[PDB]
């Protein structure tokens, strides 16, 4: 390549990172963040728990 | 015990066995072997 500090943005260098994701037949042990909130007592409310 | 791809083993030291571990390893087991 031989980039240069005075070069156009066009010849840059330019990082890239692809990420790719796979599916099979095995239990999975990649997922995605989660929430959770706080915890009231003595009330009729709607709960979930794990 | 291997069952639906979950490899869980049971252990109690000195009644009924407490759990301890489980893997999510999907591997086919058919063989056992022991070693000293």
Known sequence: YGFRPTYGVGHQPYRVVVLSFELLHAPATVCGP?????????????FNFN | K??????????????????????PIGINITRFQTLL
């Open chain 1, 34 to 46: 989660k929430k959770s909130t706080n915890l009231v007592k003595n009330k009729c409310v709607n």
């Open chain 2, 2 to 23: 291997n069952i639906d791809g979950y490899f869980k083993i049971y252990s109690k030291h000195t009644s009924a066995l407490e759990p301890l571990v489980d893997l």
